[PDB]
Enzyme design. Structure first.
Site, PDB file in Angstrom:
ATOM      1  N   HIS A   1      46.736  47.485  19.994  1.00 57.36           N
ATOM      2  CA  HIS A   1      46.860  47.010  21.369  1.00 57.36           C
ATOM      3  C   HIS A   1      47.608  48.013  22.237  1.00 57.36           C
ATOM      4  O   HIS A   1      47.395  48.081  23.446  1.00 57.36           O
ATOM      5  CB  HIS A   1      47.580  45.658  21.418  1.00 57.36           C
ATOM      6  CG  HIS A   1      46.754  44.509  20.935  1.00 57.36           C
ATOM      7  ND1 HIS A   1      46.272  44.424  19.645  1.00 57.36           N
ATOM      8  CD2 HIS A   1      46.333  43.386  21.566  1.00 57.36           C
ATOM      9  CE1 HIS A   1      45.586  43.305  19.505  1.00 57.36           C
ATOM     10  NE2 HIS A   1      45.608  42.657  20.658  1.00 57.36           N
TER      11      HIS A   1
ATOM     12  N   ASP B   1      48.747  42.126  28.143  1.00 52.52           N
ATOM     13  CA  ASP B   1      47.975  42.242  26.916  1.00 52.52           C
ATOM     14  C   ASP B   1      47.318  40.899  26.620  1.00 52.52           C
ATOM     15  O   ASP B   1      47.870  39.849  26.954  1.00 52.52           O
ATOM     16  CB  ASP B   1      48.867  42.678  25.756  1.00 52.52           C
ATOM     17  CG  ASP B   1      48.331  43.899  25.037  1.00 52.52           C
ATOM     18  OD1 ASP B   1      47.109  44.150  25.128  1.00 52.52           O
ATOM     19  OD2 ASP B   1      49.128  44.606  24.379  1.00 52.52           O
TER      20      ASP B   1
END
Ligand SMILES: O=c1ccn([C@@H]2O[C@H](COP(=O)(O)OP(=O)(O)O)[C@@H](O)[C@H]2O)c(=O)[nH]1
Lengths: 456, 432
Positions: B15, B112
């Site tokens: 990520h 995110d």
């Protein structure tokens, strides 16, 4: 708010390097930068430097300046770079429409110091704050301003003694022997250009110099107080201008050679990017490097323009002499990453011509210097370096372009450089004083901070 | 004028990379960027990355996120990366004071995809447009949005708006497990995507066909947030070294004759499969660069190949002309890296959304993916079966030609008047 600043480039790595480095700084200080290029660059290096900057900084807009067709026979000189300067200056009326197009609208135009005369009027028309980016030292910028006043005073500028001095406000007076040899020749295109530029500095909103206060011995704040009291633009010290990250290819052959050398034992030798030593002087310097008893890294140039230096080193020296030298030291006739070599710990000293960018890189990495002036502002610079205690300057050698130095002598002076402990010690000190100036609260970083806040 | 954008980071190297790259992209498009980091990072790879990012982009400011003490006992899993997420999420209300103090005033917040549900209400408090940085493909992204609605109701199939329906066999193995802390997040996140102002996906139009404009029409009717395509996300300037111990080996190999084998940072192959994969490479008779993540032929394996058991620069290895094929686990970050460099890939899905991405790669025509191999964590593949499929990859010419085609469509998408740049300009222009 992001102040949109335009950089107007001229010609030569001497001028282009601090311009690009300053562009990168501005960008990293929340400004929008647009550089105004002109092609084809005289030297291949210039072209590469710009392509490398735009590649690393996509947020930097490039507008191309298209010069008027130029007949070199209309100019005094045969020097490619000077010729290019003249081409750009003759196209000055064309910059006006070009700037109007640029969006978002500008807040300041930073002109190269060789184009000030011609483009300060242009910037005035658009109510644009103009800033001179001076590519040399402060003492050099102060002579340029004073020189018009000097020649005006002389009835006959031919019957002038080398002993005579030209008084500079706030600085130690400059001997005519230190004045660029071409200045004595008024009516040379270089002289006519620098007379007009030096008269126009006062029309700019400021003067940017690649220096920091500690280097100048603290004479700068006083000088700016006197300059302001006479309606003159301030000396703005934003140096040392940090070398960009695209200037560090960690796998260069000369860099790899250095990794196999003792700490501080290698003498780096370079005379800039637009000047080449004579055949005889090149031969003698080769002799003197062997005589020094020192490991050396030698960057040779046989012509001013790298593009035209096609001949191999074999032709000038002979394979016999050339192969012999390659045994005692590293020799290369190509473009090297100078700042990457200077930071290397194998490098203990620097034989340079006194070019300001080089000197400032050596200040930044704390490398002692042996200054050997060849032409131009290099003698004025030589004295500034000497008074900083960072370098030694052999005055007996005179100008490099008009006096031959034989091998034996060169060897002995390089030996003195490799064992000159006061230089080493001062280097370490002056280096730490350099970092402090760009850190937050640093003298240089502080001046750049008020610059951007006025833009804005 | 400069729009000030804040990036909210979570744990995980998978990520982190697209997050750091998008941060650089914004800077290069005249935005002021601030990132919100939490220390200590789970791995040194994260710390090294963020430090190298802050090293090369001084204009990017870092304000650290301090979190509430987290009791790992209340976890429904033992994964270090997923555990950190829960640690971050439960201290979400701690972000409002940090976000309000940031100067100059923020004009947008980018989150995110693992933190969307917990942090999209934070944005609403501050009158800020919130954006979801989705880390996978468009197809996988549509599954996550409609999965909550689905569970409120194996050879079965799930209806996905805009795409071919997905078999439950392609659904992540732990999605069928509602007890899992991971699944609970994904359920809570998917329902919360609708609150965000837009979903940023690492992709360009031409890769998904012309479906995105058609989809966004329908999405606009329901009041759903638009699918913002901004890819591919190019690697930063700190992610390239002039020389590497592998790269030097690659410069002695014939063009396109080298197989690159990598399965990502997070995942590690079984000891059993390593011996099998090892023997399949030798059986393939192809030059190969092998990355081993965690021995008599160990020296004999180096005969026609190169093995490294450490962090490598994929973007360097993938640009290299010696590399002709890619054996990937199917991560969307590594996949786009291969799209951009136009390298044909053999997808071998191991876990997560890799089976979903595999279908995205196959449909585009850039890769082949062996259905017969199933999941890597579940199913073992013998050496003779591996080596055969590699040769199919190294001898497939339609693949190599499709790769060349996609590479230009990808490259055209970044340049001026390109697909992805158009959406990005209009985005920043709205901030303004
Ligand atoms: O072989 C070379 C020659 C030049 N330079 C760079 O070019 C600039 C030359 O600037 P200088 O002050 O010497 O002025 P010049 O006389 O060269 O025009 C310096 O910054 C050097 O770093 C370099 O990197 N490698």
């Amino acid at each position: 708010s992001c102040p949109h600043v335009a950089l107007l480039l001229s010609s030569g790595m001497g001028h282009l390097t601090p311009c690009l480095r300053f562009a990168a700084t501005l960008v990293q200080h929340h400004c929008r930068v647009t550089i105004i290029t002109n092609y084809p660059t005289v030297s291949v290096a210039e072209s590469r430097a710009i392509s490398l900057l735009l590649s690393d900084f996509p947020q930097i807009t490039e507008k191309q300046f298209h010069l008027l067709p130029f007949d070199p026979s209309t100019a005094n000189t045969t020097d490619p770079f000077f010729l290019r300067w003249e081409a750009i200056r003759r196209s000055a009326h064309l910059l006006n429409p070009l700037l109007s197009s640029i969006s978002p609208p500008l807040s300041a135009l930073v002109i190269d110091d060789s184009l000030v005369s011609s483009f300060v009027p242009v910037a005035a028309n658009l109510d644009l704050p103009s800033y001179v980016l001076f590519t040399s030292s402060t003492r050099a910028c102060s002579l340029e301003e004073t020189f018009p006043a000097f020649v005006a005073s002389k009835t006959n500028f031919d019957s002038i003694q080398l002993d005579d001095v030209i008084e500079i406000p706030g600085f130690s007076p400059v001997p005519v022997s230190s004045v660029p040899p071409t200045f004595l020749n008024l009516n040379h295109l270089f002289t006519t250009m620098l007379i007009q530029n030096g008269q126009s500095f006062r029309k700019a909103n400021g003067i940017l110099i690649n220096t920091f206060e500690a280097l100048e011995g603290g004479i700068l704040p006083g000088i700016n107080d006197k300059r302001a009291a006479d309606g003159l633009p301030p000396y703005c010290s934003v140096g040392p201008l940090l070398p960009c990250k695209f200037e560090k290819t960690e796998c260069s052959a000369p860099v790899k050679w250095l990794d196999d050398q003792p700490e501080g034992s290698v003498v780096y030798v370079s005379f800039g990017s637009r000047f080449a030593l004579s055949s005889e002087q090149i031969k003698e310097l080769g002799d003197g490097l062997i005589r020094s008893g020192c490991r050396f890294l030698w960057v040779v140039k046989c012509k001013k323009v790298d593009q035209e230096d096609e001949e191999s080193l074999d032709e000038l020296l002979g394979r016999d002499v050339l192969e012999k030298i390659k045994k005692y030291g590293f020799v290369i006739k190509n473009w090297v990453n100078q700042q990457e070599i200077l930071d290397h710990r194998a490098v203990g000293g620097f034989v340079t011509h006194g070019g300001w960018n080089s000197s400032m890189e050596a200040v930044w990495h704390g490398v002692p210097m042996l200054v050997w002036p060849q032409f131009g502002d290099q003698k004025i610079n030589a004295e500034v370096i000497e008074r900083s205690g960072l370098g030694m300057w052999v005055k007996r050698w005179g100008w490099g372009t008009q006096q031959l130095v034989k091998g034996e002598e060169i060897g002995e002076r390089i030996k003195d450089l490799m064992g000159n402990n006061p230089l080493r010690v001062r280097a370490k000190t002056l280096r730490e004083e350099a970092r402090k100036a760009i850190e937050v609260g640093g003298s240089s970083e502080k001046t750049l901070k008020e610059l951007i806040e006025n833009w804005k």
